[PDB]
Design a protein around this nucleic acid. Sequence first.
DNA 1: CTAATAAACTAAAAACTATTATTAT
DNA 2: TAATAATAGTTTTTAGTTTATTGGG
Lengths: 794, 115
Amino acid sequence: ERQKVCLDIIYKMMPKLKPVELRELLNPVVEFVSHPSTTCREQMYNILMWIHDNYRDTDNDSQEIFKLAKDVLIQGLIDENPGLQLIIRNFWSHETRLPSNTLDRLLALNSLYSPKIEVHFLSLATNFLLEMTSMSPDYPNPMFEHPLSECEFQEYTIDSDWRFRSTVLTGRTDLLRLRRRFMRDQEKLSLMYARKGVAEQKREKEIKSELKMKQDAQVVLYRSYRHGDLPDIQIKHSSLITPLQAVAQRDPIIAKQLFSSLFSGILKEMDKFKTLSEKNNITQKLLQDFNRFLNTTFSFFPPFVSCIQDISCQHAALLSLDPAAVSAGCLASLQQPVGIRLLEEALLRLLLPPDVLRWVELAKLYRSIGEYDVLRGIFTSEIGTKQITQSALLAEARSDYSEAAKQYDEALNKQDWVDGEPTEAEKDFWELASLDCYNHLAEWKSLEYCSTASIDSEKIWSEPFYQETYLPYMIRSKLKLLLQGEADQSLLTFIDKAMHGELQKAILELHYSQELSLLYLLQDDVDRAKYYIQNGIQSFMQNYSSIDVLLHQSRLTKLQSVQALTEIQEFISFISKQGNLSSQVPLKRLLNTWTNRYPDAKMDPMNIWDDIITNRCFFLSKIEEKLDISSLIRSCKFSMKMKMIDSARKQNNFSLAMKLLKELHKESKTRDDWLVSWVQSYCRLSHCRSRSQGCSEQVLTVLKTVSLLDENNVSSYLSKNILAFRDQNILLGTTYRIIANALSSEPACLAEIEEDKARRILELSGEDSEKVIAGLYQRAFQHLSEAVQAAEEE
Amino acid sequence: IRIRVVQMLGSLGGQINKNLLMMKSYVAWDREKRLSFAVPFREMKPVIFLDVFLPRVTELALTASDRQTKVAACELLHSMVMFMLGKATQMPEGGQGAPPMYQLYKRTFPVLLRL
DNA sequence: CTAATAAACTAAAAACTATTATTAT
DNA sequence: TAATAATAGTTTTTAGTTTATTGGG
């Protein structure tokens, strides 16, 4: 009552006010959007449309009032009440707000944008541009004046029910007013009991009514259907446009391509009769509009960004967007390759070449998609100013990120430039590639080096666009730092101040909510962690609905993401629900089982990997601190880490966690089996370590101390399976073969020339190199044979 | 239902989950724009092509949740198919005497019959 | 050869608002 | 099914001690 009367106050009194008092009054008013009652919402909408119409021109402050009014209107273009949506659509669709010309409608919809309704603007624009197409003379008329043949096209009605298939097998009324209240020959409290009983039956009637209403609302069609034996082509244009706009408001992607088609067709029809000067000027206006759209958006919905860059693709004059903006949108929204063609054709049309910006953007996007061939195929050109970048990328093509990080660091720290200073974009490439390779270098030290507050002293560290790129890397660094058993509260304070500021907080939940969930688990804020994680998973599955089927790789990455999401949510789904302090439920004995579910081997790069193990170990730590069991959790993490190192060796990320392996050996003396398994892991890794310099490399470290002198308990004195025994025989024969081949290929190696313990052990295992290679080949044959007879014993 | 699906799907295993996805499974549905439609207007009228719509609306009305979306997409595709057959009967093209949407017929008849 | 006692002191109860459950249907 | 009638919460006296204050004998 009071809110409604106050809005009516404002509505009646504001037509007699100064702009300054209006701007004073609107700030404590406009925020009443998202009020639980809708009626106040359309009341303020009436106020907003009034001032919108009254403010058109002058004073820049009244113009600011006008800007804020259209802003609150356009963000009001979504309401839960469909009637509000209908009335605002009717208001905006009028010729005054949006002029009836199609190109006028286009420029008007360009004039309006909001960063938050970027999900729905495509559908809204399609609805605006199609429902307006209703005053065309042929619009009620059928498309085809001819029928197929003679037939009776009687209408075929269609039913509708909440039930589905597979449910059943087989003042003239004064008599009423005169007889309404003849209470006199009745009792009062008996009538009271009747009234309250009737109230009770109405209560359970409401109960069953809401039980029925639990299901979806009844589906309504949008086109009358006639019936006949021959199809009736002669049907109105409404019959196809109305389902088209309906499904456009249903699905975003179909709205995407139909919007693209209508945009391309309308431009291809407008160009035929307008002067080239006006068409050109309109084209730059559009280009500015799209640049504004991409700069202002934050939640990069793949359909919207992809459709705007796609409609820019079809027109040569539209190949002039801010290419860095295009690159950022494509990488963030995972719509990369089409934007790659955008950059390519913009380069192609533009034809001294300053295209280094397009080059660097396409190169970083190709690095994002994973491949490396285009990178070198491009930077082998003279346009590549710094060949250090080319050398770094070709050398890390074998997943050698350490040297690439070294090259990036020395390049950014190379102040002198005899060949000319590199462009800012090239240095941005270098630092972002260093960030990505450090992300591959799963250790927290690389992450801290990322978080070393880069040059120019870089919420405080969020506003510039370079910082926007760093924020995911920065927070990933911070969480990997803290979750491993570290505490600084700097990240907590940062996200607390990031709550202040709607845009920063908004982007961090809409993209990175599981980070909030995990840190709230760190603070034991299980409720808000659950809220964040459910928000993340539902938003992400919505994105999976949004992404197209062609790009398998993005869907794969999303798949691994939601895999990690489900392990963390099932962890939070079992904390003390049954009560777990001394109740040794098999759940703990079951969650570790199946190798603590599938670790997703042989693919799924290392960031998935270390996230999985880090969260799992932090979990089991939380249980054991809130609950022989330690032996079980140690064995579990042992298995986790062995699967890790084996898979990452299969990943050929040969810059493995060396010191992690060293400490695995260091406290590998839990039982013999554990240290034995570590020994086989290390020796197999060194076996795979053979490379171009695998000759000198393998002869300098011949499985360190010759299989680490493992000749004490083979298969734990054969007490284990002889499959293990045949495994060590295989490894020993393998390293014998590698050394013998290395010596045969390089009889004059420096290491064998060098008088060292390697010389002693090689002559022991063997004078002349021929005798040594014959002896080592004999030993290799012997050990491989031993593995062979140990093999057949199943 | 959907949250259960996604959570347990993740719980299965990522490479195991990969089995949801080899002749590349898509190139195009036509070698040229065999079908087009001119949207009317009070002013001049541009031309739109249904071919880009055809496949994705086909699976969208084939199988999905949100029965409202299913019904709306079905109604749209029925209006679509009536319009395209009428256009084919209107002015036949060449190449096979009249292959208007012949390959497209080969694609649409299976989806029509299974829906 | 041993005091009412004036003042100080806390206690206790009434007066005046004083909104706040509280039935009817 | 949705009202109004009891109705506590601050001042403010006032009795109820208490005292610490003399000369009594």
